[PDB]
């Protein structure tokens, strides 16, 4: 056994080894920190050096759901309490009291306008003015909208967003009689959005999809884009789109998927949340 008080723990005196190791590790930490810092000196702080791994942005939905299935009982408030609580917690930033003029935010055109930019990416200009987006646009529920009032008028209103990407200005398609056939849609300033899932196979027209946003067209207004950076555009308010299903059958399991069309927006097979967006809705009575 390792004795003591007679000759030492395996001889030693345990200073040369300890001092050598500590000085070696100090030198190694020093060179590591120096390498990291000189690396940091070669990259910018306003724009990434690489953006290709960020494909056309994914259309993630705002209601966070664990098993990607919205299951709830309308009669019992506790069944869907978490969903509405999460929605109001997220949307408390979008409230009209948070949005104000005088270089906090800016006034923006009610109609979908051109994607106006603010200038270059250099630091000669401070925080560029950002648009505003109140909750007045969301509604059409024969009353106030709040966020997720909680009635059984179909289902709790789920609302979808586009992942903000630095220096990215989406381009809506520009042609006549494309593969998309909506009731009312004009090419500029809006990206058309459709919510159809497993059509003619299993869905068999379970419910009616109603979109309400800015400009009455099913899409994100273009005047908000493009992003400029958290360091350059703090508290940036991205455009939002809200959907509601009214005549949705109960006690039925259906799969509905919403996707956004665009010339520069891409779709992938492995990535099930890029561009398109899949979600499950289950309601029981």
């Amino acid at each position: 056994s390792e004795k003591k008080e007679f000759l030492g723990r395996t001889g030693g005196s345990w200073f040369k080894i300890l001092l050598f190791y500590v000085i070696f590790y100090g030198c190694l930490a020093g060179i590591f920190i120096g390498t990291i810092q000189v690396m940091l000196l070669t990259i910018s702080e306003f724009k990434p050096t690489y953006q290709d791994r960020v494909a056309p942005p994914g259309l993630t939905q705002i209601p966070q759901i664990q098993k990607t299935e919205i299951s709830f009982r309308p009669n019992d408030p506790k069944s869907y309490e978490a969903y509405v609580l999460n929605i109001v917690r997220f949307l408390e930033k979008y409230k009209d009291s948070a949005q104000r003029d005088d270089m906090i935010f800016e006034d923006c055109g009610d109609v979908p306008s051109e994607p106006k930019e603010r200038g270059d990416f250099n630091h000669e200009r401070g925080e560029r003015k950002v648009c505003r987006f109140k909750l007045e646009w969301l509604g059409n529920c024969s009353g106030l909208n709040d966020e997720t009032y909680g009635y059984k008028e179909g289902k709790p209103c789920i609302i979808i967003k586009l992942n903000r990407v630095l220096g990215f200005k989406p381009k809506p398609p520009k042609n006549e009689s494309l593969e998309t056939y909506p009731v009312m849609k004009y090419n500029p300033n809006v990206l058309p959005v459709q919510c159809t899932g497993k059509r003619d196979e299993d869905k068999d027209k379970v419910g009616n999809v109603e979109y309400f946003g800015l400009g009455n067209s099913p899409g994100f207004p273009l005047q908000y884009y493009p992003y400029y950076g958290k360091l350059l555009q703090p508290k940036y308010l991205q455009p939002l789109l809200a959907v509601q299903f009214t005549n949705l059958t109960m006690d039925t399991e259906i799969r509905i998927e919403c996707k956004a069309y665009g010339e520069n927006i891409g779709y992938s097979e492995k990535d099930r949340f890029q561009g398109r967006f899949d979600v499950k809705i289950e309601v029981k009575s």
């Binding site: 990291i36 953006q51 960020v54 950076g229 958290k230």
Partner: protein, 982 residues
């Protein structure tokens, strides 16, 4: 033994009739009573179990334990919250597949090595001439039973152990039990109290040479002398070889670094606040990444290459681990007949004209050995040709003269070989001069006469050529033949002759002198009747011409090999079963005992005192008779082995060989024996490595050894010792290079768990770096040469300098591995910050990074990522870490090319090492760029600017080791050498 019993007693003891023999009725029933007359079959070979005992070996235990633990972790993960990640199952399957794949390769390289000995052992004579009911029968030897009298002619092997009762000049060549090349006569009398050295019995499987002897069997089958001495399975097979002991130390004391490092971080997870089930998953993961799955498949290949190289030198190796055991070899043991000497007797010296003309075994008479122009030499050659009664076997003109079997007496065989080497075809000389009369050869007369004519056709002067030791012919010889002039009895020429003789019988040699007296034609005319029984010649009044020496010489390559072995720190000990004088003379000639070293007998003779009077420690070299070993205790053997120095054992029975081998092993030394006969089999079984001759080796000692010399050149053993030292050094270097790539495989998971950052290195990438790029370099590190002091290096002490020590582990885990991990992490940070995640924002992000639902993970800049995109970035960071590890391993291998000499000083002369580097880089590039594999092996291409991220770390490690080696060289024995030089 029942050799002291009379002939009458033996006849009644076995019911044998001393003349009639054994009747058919008795022999038929007693055959099945005592079993057949054959050796007991060797122990059963577990054909199917031997393979299963090779993949459960000393090193494969670690992987099997590692494989089981991996499956346990994955089974645990499935039971708890659903974890689709099978990374702990992919590793588990491939971990076991390494053992099975390398198990088959090890067996194939071993079963083939045992597929040659099957052809080596094939001999089924099984014949005898036994007398049953008074009739001789050429019956097969398989049925020979105790209780019948058997008859042996000349040129056939004995059927079993015999009690010789009537022999007529029968000489038997044992060369296997007593270790005697000289055929001793057989007579019904008693010679010694030891039946081994007696004269009235014959031993099993000892082919006779000449004479017919009648004997009664005493022991047959497994109970004979060969039956028991050659049936010792001893204890464990060579116990544990030195290399296998190092592996057992490398496992049971360097798996603790896995247990301690795993346990010391298991409680850290508990301190942080992780769950009970997750904590053990971390412990299993960190304790199994510490075992390298590239070291069992490298060590096995590294040893295979050396054996293949030694197979080119006709050094057949049985055990795959038998290459190393010849390396250390603290002490060595040998023999005499078969191993050191050629078991055949040749000419050595010819003394005449007051000169010694030492015959040269070399094929050119090197060093003016003899005067080949003198007329005395020609007359000596003529007398040798005439007096020879042997005949060279026909149809052998295409074979070397010394390696051809001949028929006749062994002394006549040496004479015939010498005559053939010197002049040419002896048959022409024999046929040129017709024979006239002959004289018998027997021990009763001890002098052989022969009558032959003259070479010149005219003046056919009748001469009676004679052969015999001059110590009995001097009183029967009057004049002397000296180059034409005759020297009669005088106090000068005869005293010079005696002086020349004196240092000929002192060499353990039976001098056979040459005599020939020319019978005058005045008294003995042309037609003189010649009768062998009647007296018609002059016994006295003879003359002398020259002397011959019949001592069997040692092998051509044995003295230089023994000298190099002694200079290499290996103590050489000679053990044999011959008379002490001949064994000591042969040892002195070989070089086993240093020149000028006087033994206790010589010291005693110096001042004419008993050997007890002189202090035993005065004489360093001593020779001990075998009859004292039975009266020697273990302490006496230890004290003579330690206090004294190189020594020679004489008249040692095989049990005494086992005793001395065990005693030498007891003192913490590694003993290699180089026996060749059948009496050395137990010693070869017990010795740490047994080297046995193949051409002249026996049938049971050859199969009970570890290395077999097909060429029978002793210098192959010194080649083997140098190769063993070299392969030990290369294995140490390769193990260090394989081990240093462990920290960059443990640190990623440690930082991923403790610091909560995205995983830097996956599991499949660890398998790739362990089995695809760290293998070919590891093998190629064993093809390199060593520093020029490999021959004079003292043998490694098997208790101080191990294969893996604390210095090597420290070097692999504290500095080199840390530098590699630092470079990999720098590359990982570089590639995860060029995409948006600044280094400061990575801390505390793993919980959200690995979540499937979170598809809006905001990075440092502000933009959000989905799950798939950030997973793609993580996987390309994995590939970056792999490439960085390869780039650092460039320098890791370059600095591991040598231990003391710098890279520039030693030089990069290895042609396979550069190919290893280039193949490493080629596999790294191809496996990270081949399209359509990122979905299977999970590797994505990286930008060209990212290949260079690991260059500064490789340069730093190369410079650091260059400085370290310079410090080691400049200050020998310093602190750095003490604490770093593994």
């Amino acid at each position: 033994t029942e050799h002291k019993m009379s002939v009458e007693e033996v006849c009644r003891k076995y019911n044998t009739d001393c003349v009639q023999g054994l009747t058919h009725s008795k022999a038929q029933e007693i055959l099945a009573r005592d079993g057949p007359n054959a050796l007991t079959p060797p122990p059963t070979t577990p054909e199917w179990v031997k393979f299963c005992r090779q993949l459960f070996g000393g090193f494969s235990i670690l992987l099997w334990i590692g494989a089981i633990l991996c499956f346990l972790a994955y089974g645990i993960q499935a039971g708890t919250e659903d974890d689709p990640s099978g990374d702990n199952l992919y590793l588990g399957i491939v971990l076991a597949a390494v053992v099975i794949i390398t198990g088959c390769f090890s067996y194939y390289q071993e079963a083939k090595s045992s597929k040659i000995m099957e052809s080596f052992k094939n001999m089924v004579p099984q014949q005898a001439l036994v007398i049953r009911e008074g009739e001789k029968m050429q019956v097969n030897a398989e049925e020979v039973v105790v209780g019948d009298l058997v008859e042996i002619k000349g040129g056939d092997r004995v059927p079993a152990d015999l009690r010789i009762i009537s022999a007529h000049g029968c000489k038997v060549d044992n060369s296997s039990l007593t270790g005697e090349s000289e055929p001793q006569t057989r007579s019904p009398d008693c010679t010694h109290d030891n039946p081994l050295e007696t004269r009235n019995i014959t031993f099993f499987s000892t082919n006779c040479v000449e004479g017919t002897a009648r004997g009664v069997v005493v022991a047959t089958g497994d109970r004979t002398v060969m039956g028991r001495i050659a049936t010792l399975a001893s204890g464990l097979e060579v116990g544990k070889t030195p290399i296998a002991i190092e592996i057992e130390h490398f496992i049971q004391l360097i798996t603790g670094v896995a247990v301690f490092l795993g346990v010391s971080f298991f409680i850290l997870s508990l301190i942080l606040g992780y769950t009970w089930l997750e904590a053990v998953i971390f412990l299993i993961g960190i304790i199994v990444a510490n075992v390298p799955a590239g070291l069992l498949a490298t060590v096995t290949v590294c040893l295979t290459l050396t054996a293949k190289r030694m197979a080119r030198k006709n050094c057949l190796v049985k055990n795959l681990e038998a290459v190393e055991t010849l390396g250390s070899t603290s002490t060595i043991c040998s023999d005499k007949t078969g191993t050191l000497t050629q078991n055949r007797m040749t000419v050595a010296h010819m003394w005449f004209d007051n000169q010694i003309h030492e015959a040269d075994t070399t094929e050119d008479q090197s060093g003016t050995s003899f005067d080949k122009s003198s007329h005395t030499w020609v007359a000596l050659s003529h007398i040798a040709g005439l007096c020879n009664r042997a005949v060279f076997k026909g149809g052998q003109d295409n074979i070397p003269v010394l390696k051809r079997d001949v028929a006749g007496d062994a002394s006549e065989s040496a004479l015939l070989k010498c005559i053939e080497l010197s002049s040419g075809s002896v048959k022409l000389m024999r046929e040129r001069n017709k024979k006239v009369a002959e004289i018998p050869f027997n021990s009763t007369n001890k002098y052989q006469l022969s009558i032959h004519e003259t070479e010149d056709p005219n003046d056919n002067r009748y001469l009676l050529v004679m052969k015999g030791a001059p110590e009995r012919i001097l009183d029967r010889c009057s004049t002397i033949l000296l180059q034409g002039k005759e020297q009669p009895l005088d106090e000068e020429m005869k005293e010079a002759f005696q002086n020349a003789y004196l240092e000929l019988g002192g060499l353990g040699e039976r001098v056979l002198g040459f005599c020939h007296y020319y019978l005058p034609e005045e008294q003995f005319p042309k037609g003189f009747a010649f009768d062998c029984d009647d007296v018609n010649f002059t016994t006295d009044n003879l003359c002398f011409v020259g002397l011959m020496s019949m001592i069997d010489p040692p092998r051509a390559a044995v003295p230089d090999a023994v000298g190099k072995c002694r200079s290499a720190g290996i103590k050489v000990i000679m053990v044999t079963g011959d008379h002490p004088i001949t064994a000591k003379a042969i040892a002195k000639g070989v070089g086993i005992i240093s020149e000028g070293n006087e033994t206790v007998e010589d010291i005693a003779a110096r001042l004419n005192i008993p050997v007890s009077q002189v202090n035993p420690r005065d004489a360093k070299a001593c020779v001990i008779h075998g009859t004292d070993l039975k009266d020697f205790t273990s302490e006496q053997i230890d004290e003579i082995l330690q206090n004294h120095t190189e020594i020679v054992f004489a008249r040692t029975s095989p049990q005494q060989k086992l005793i001395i081998v065990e005693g030498c092993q007891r003192q913490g030394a590694i003993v290699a024996v180089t026996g060749d006969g059948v009496n050395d089999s137990p010693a070869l079984k017990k010795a740490d490595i047994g080297v046995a001759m193949g051409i002249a080796g026996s049938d049971v000692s050859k199969q009970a050894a570890d290395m077999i010399l097909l060429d029978d050149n002793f210098a192959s053993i010194v080649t083997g010792v140098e190769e063993g030292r070299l392969i030990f050094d290369n294995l140490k270097k390769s193990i260090a290079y394989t081990l240093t790539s462990n920290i960059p495989a443990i640190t990623p998971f440690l930082l991923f768990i403790m610091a909560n950052i995205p995983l830097p290195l996956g599991t499949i990438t660890i398998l790739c770096i362990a089995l695809g790029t760290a293998m070919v370099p590891a093998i190629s590190l064993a093809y390199e040469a060593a520093e020029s002091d490999i021959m004079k290096r003292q043998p490694r002490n098997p208790r101080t300098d191990k294969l893996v020590n604390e210095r090597l582990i420290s070097m692999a885990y504290g500095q080199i591995g840390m530098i590699q991990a630092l470079g990999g992490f720098f590359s990982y940070f570089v590639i995860l910050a060029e995409n948006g995640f600044l280094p400061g924002n990575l801390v505390g992000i793993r919980l959200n990074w690995d979540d499937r639902t979170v598809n809006d993970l905001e990075d440092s800049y502000g933009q959000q990522w989905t799950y798939e995109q950030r997973k793609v970035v993580e996987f390309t960071c994995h590939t970056a870490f792999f490439v960085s590890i390869v780039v650092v391993q460039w320098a890791d291998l370059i600095i591991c090319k040598t231990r003391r000499n710098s890279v520039f000083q030693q030089g990069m002369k290895n042609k396979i090492l550069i190919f290893g580097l280039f193949e490493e880089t080629a596999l790294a590039a191809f496996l990270s760029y081949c399209p359509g594999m990122d979905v299977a092996l999970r590797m994505y291409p990286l930008k060209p600017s990212w290949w260079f991220c690991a260059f500064p770390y490789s340069f730093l490690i190369f410079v650091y080791d260059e400085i370290r080696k310079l410090i080691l060289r400049r200050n020998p024995g310093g602190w750095v050498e003490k604490e770093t030089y593994y």
